[PDB]
RNA sequence: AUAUACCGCCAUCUUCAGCAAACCCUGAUGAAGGCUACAAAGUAAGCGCAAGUACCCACGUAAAGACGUUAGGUCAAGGUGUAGCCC
């Protein structure tokens, strides 16, 4: 009958069951699913199976400066017609299988080290272009609730960086996964660490600190060290613009503890420029691949004082016993100085 | 071609001049010391950053050295008057009802802007949801008060830190000075100290905007002639 | 809870029409009727009839004219003429417009035995009163 | 015959830019740490494997003593050492090629 | 055949007042938390309630009543996914 036919987006919408408590706790998973697809998509308005020419819908209304009549596509022409809409449907379904996968992270099911983007541009015409996002975490939370039982919400991690000192870091929290990821990027971007850097490539003194459980111990390197760092390390260090460091990270390994305890360590290193202006002295650099020539890298703004720096025969600095034992040809590990691809 | 010109006679030359609007004629330590300004509060109050402008207690009492606060109120109305030059906005922050309304007349008076009232979460940090994207958000933030009604640091000197205005303060001798750009140790409770103040920054806003009126008018004369 | 005809909470992204925005019970109260006729009123014959009428009218535009329709038809009966009022879209070319306006007019006509005519408003887009 | 054309022309920066050869490459392996020999070679009985190396990948990259503007994709320009072949995950057979060509 | 694939139309708490987003801030940027009116971090919008409308009023009665709960009811209103029958 045709009063008992319905639209499409009625048939559509009961095939699919998208809707139903199926899909409401995910109680039905989906290896097969039933697919949506545009049946109005390259369907133009006047073709039907007679193959008629109506002059003014599907053909042009005047040819050759008269009006057309009423003509209908032969037997042969017709089915060429049929024919070629088959092929450019299956072609239509080939490119749209046709899609450009992205690159992995630190594993296959991570989402660690996949790039989000650049944050998205602000109301007034703000935008981020030079800025790289990276995600650090991502947990699903799980929260007991008075009346809905255990829900799931989305926990993410994310940091930010032009590659030229300015880096920050956000958490992002909501139910979707996408939204966690957009609410982390941007608010990043407005929680900016300057980071110093030593000739733009490393950081300008070794760095030891804890922050919480979490140590981390960093060493100032030279020009093509890499990054032989904690993984996420690696990945904020690319995003600072630090390209030789080494870092060590003992204790707990809690990502947000290393990524905030990172951050405050970065932040708090003093530049030759100021241990110059702080002890009025010159900062001489000596290089063993430039013999005993002195090279000045800082020098104080004001006053230069005349009284030389004590020299206490044996300073009282603390030692790390790892540091010791490696200068030592004490520290064996199979697993340190392995090759690695380039970072 | 005019505007490097325009910016160097009219925007830096007033920053090469140690005391362009004479600031220093507006107050002395003894015209501060007869509005009370000295007095501080019990030294049982007394907040350790305010321990180096304090002069020292005079039977439990904090006496605040007035020869700093000579020296700290200079440079905040020093920055004050060249902010008002500029044309930036300055917004008035206190949250003491006694002088609630003093201020907000004092604020209309001078052309500026007063927040006395109490400060809802997110004023500055969430100001474009709240006025719209294109909100313009005060230059400089002036506390008279820099506590809040139970005695804890107002909210906005911290959401001025975050949206990097800079902020003039009274602090008195119970308050945290260590996020006030400009701090300026003094009394914050006589009525005397409070006046005081009040003149003296709307003072220093109306001869800073008088003063960049005049230097505009004869920047366009000398121009077309 | 109740379901006939009511546009459900989205999460703010579905725009809806004035009248997908109302539900039955604002018929009357803040929406009209989509067809008018006498066949309803009191003493009045033929509502069968021209209900049956409605609802072809109504099959048969959506298909005639497919996806250029931006809202639902108001049909419109005096005397025996029959006035089809239809908002569509700006997306099909004018010839074809008036292709489909003369066919469908002669089409209509012979098959319901009365003058019939169509009357068609074109808009950029979907008028959309809310997003739900 | 020419090998340091290919290195000049605009079909080589399209693909590669200012980059190195072996800057998007990427060893398929398990665990965290990879295996301390790349695998032998990449051609095998004309073949190639599925995951090319940087080198193999490309046949117009030809590992030869004159073209040296390839050749120093693989030396540090900072301390003149020749990367060991996990670094730029090139197979045995065209590290060792790369190293005879280097000297 | 399957309401335990669904649309459609509903029951139920509801003789309820809450639900879902976009932001902001606190907790060291932990799971989490965000109210004080002589106010101390919450806020510009959506849905429901409310308002309004129908009936004889501004009362009452209708109507309305979100999200979610019971894989609640209905494949036998009609339509329909999947599977099955076609002497
Ligand atoms: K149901
Ligand atoms: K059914
Ligand atoms: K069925
Ligand atoms: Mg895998
Ligand atoms: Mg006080
Ligand atoms: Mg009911
Ligand atoms: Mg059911
Ligand atoms: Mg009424
Ligand atoms: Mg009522
Ligand atoms: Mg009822
Ligand atoms: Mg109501
Ligand atoms: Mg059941
Ligand atoms: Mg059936
Ligand atoms: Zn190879």
């Known amino acids: 009958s045709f009063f008992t036919k319905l639209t499409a987006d009625e048939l559509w919408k009961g095939a699919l069951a998208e809707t139903g408590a199926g899909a409401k706790k995910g109680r039905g998973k989906r290896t097969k699913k039933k697919k949506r697809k545009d049946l109005n998509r390259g369907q133009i308005i006047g073709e039907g199976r007679y193959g008629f020419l109506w002059p003014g819908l599907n053909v042009p209304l005047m040819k050759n400066g008269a009006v057309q009549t009423i003509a209908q596509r032969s037997k042969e022409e017709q089915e060429k017609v049929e024919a070629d809409m088959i092929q450019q449907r299956e072609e239509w379904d080939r490119k749209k299988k046709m899609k450009v996968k992205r690159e992995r992270g630190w594993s296959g099911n991570s989402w660690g080290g996949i790039s989000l983007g650049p944050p998205d541009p602000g109301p007034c015409g703000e935008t981020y272009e030079d800025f790289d996002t990276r995600i650090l975490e991502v947990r699903n939370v799980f929260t007991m609730t008075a009346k809905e039982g255990r829900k799931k919400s989305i926990r993410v991690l994310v940091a930010v960086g032009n590659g030229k000192g300015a880096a920050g870091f956000s958490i992002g929290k909501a139910t ?76 707990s390994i809690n990502m947000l503890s290393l990524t905030q305890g990172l951050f405050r360590g970065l932040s708090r290193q003093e530049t030759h420029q100021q241990l110059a202006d702080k002890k009025g002295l010159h900062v001489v650099e000596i290089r063993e691949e430039c013999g005993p020539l002195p090279i000045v890298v800082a020098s104080p703004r004001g006053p230069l004082r005349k009284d030389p720096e004590p020299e206490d025969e044996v300073p009282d600095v603390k030692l790390d016993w790892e540091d010791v034992k490696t200068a030592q040809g004490m520290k064996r590990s199979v697993w340190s100085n392995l090759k690695r691809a380039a970072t | 071609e005019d505007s490097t010109d325009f910016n160097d006679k009219i925007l830096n030359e007033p920053l090469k001049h140690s005391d362009f609007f004479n600031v220093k004629e507006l107050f002395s330590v003894r015209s501060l010391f007869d509005a009370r300004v000295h007095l501080g509060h019990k030294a049982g109050c007394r907040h350790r950053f305010m321990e180096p402008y304090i002069f020292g207690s005079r039977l439990d009492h904090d006496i605040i050295d007035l020869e700093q606060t000579a020296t700290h109120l200079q440079l905040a109305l020093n920055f004050t008057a060249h902010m008002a030059y500029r044309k930036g906005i300055i917004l008035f922050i206190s949250r003491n009802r006694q002088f609630s309304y003093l201020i907000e007349n004092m604020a209309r008076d001078c052309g500026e802007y007063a927040h006395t009232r109490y400060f809802r979460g997110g004023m500055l ?52 000075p260590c996020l006030i750009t400009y701090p300026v140790p003094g009394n914050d409770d006589s009525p005397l100290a409070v006046h005081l103040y009040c003149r003296l920054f709307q003072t220093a806003i109306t001869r800073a905007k008088e003063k960049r009126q005049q230097v505009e008018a004869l920047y366009r004369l000398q121009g077309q002639k | 809870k109740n379901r006939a005809a009511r546009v459900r909470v989205s999460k703010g992204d579905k725009p809806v029409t004035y009248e997908e925005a109302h539900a039955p019970h604002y018929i009357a109260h803040r929406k009209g009727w989509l067809s008018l006729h006498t066949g309803n009123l009191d003493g009045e014959d033929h509502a069968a009839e021209r209900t049956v009428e409605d609802v072809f009218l109504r099959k048969f535009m959506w298909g005639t004219f497919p996806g250029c329709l931006a809202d639902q038809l108001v049909l419109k009966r005096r005397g025996n003429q029959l006035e089809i009022c239809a908002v569509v879209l700006r997306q099909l070319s004018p010839h074809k417009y008036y292709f489909l306006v003369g066919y469908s007019e002669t089409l209509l006509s012979y098959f319901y035995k009365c003058p019939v005519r169509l009357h068609l408003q074109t808009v950029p887009s979907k008028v959309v009163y809310k997003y739900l | 015959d020419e090998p340091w054309k290919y290195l000049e022309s605009e079909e080589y920066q399209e693909r590669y ?60 320009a900072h301390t003149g050492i020749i990367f060991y072949a996990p670094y730029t995950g090139v197979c045995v057979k065209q590290h060792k090629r790369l190293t005879q060509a280097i000297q």
Request: net charge positive; proline share 5%; aromatic share 8%.
């Open chain 4, 17 to 76: 830019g200012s980059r190195p050869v072996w800057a998007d490459y990427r060893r398929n392996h398990k665990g965290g740490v990879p295996p301390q020999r790349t695998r032998k070679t990449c051609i095998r009985r004309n073949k190639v494997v599925g995951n090319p190396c940087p080198i193999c990948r490309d046949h117009k990259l030809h590992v030869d003593f004159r073209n040296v503007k390839l050749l120093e994709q693989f030396v540090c």
């Open chain 1, 176 to 251: 979707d996964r996408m939204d966690a990821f957009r609410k982390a990027k941007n608010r990043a971007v407005h929680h900016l660490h300057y980071i110093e850097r030593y000739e733009d490539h490393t950081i300008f003194h070794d760095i030891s600190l804890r922050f919480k459980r979490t140590h981390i111990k960093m060493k100032k390197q030279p020009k093509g060290y890499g990054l032989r760092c904690h993984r996420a390390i690696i990945t904020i260090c690319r995003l600072i613009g630090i390209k030789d460091m080494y870092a060590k990270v003992s204790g």
């Open chain 2, 125 to 176: 940090t969430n100001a474009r949801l709240l006025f719209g994207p294109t909100v313009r958000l005060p230059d400089l933030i002036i506390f008279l008060h820099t506590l809040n009604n139970i005695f804890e640091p107002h909210v906005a000197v911290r959401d001025a830190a975050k949206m990097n205005i800079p902020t003039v303060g009274i602090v008195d001798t119970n308050c945290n």
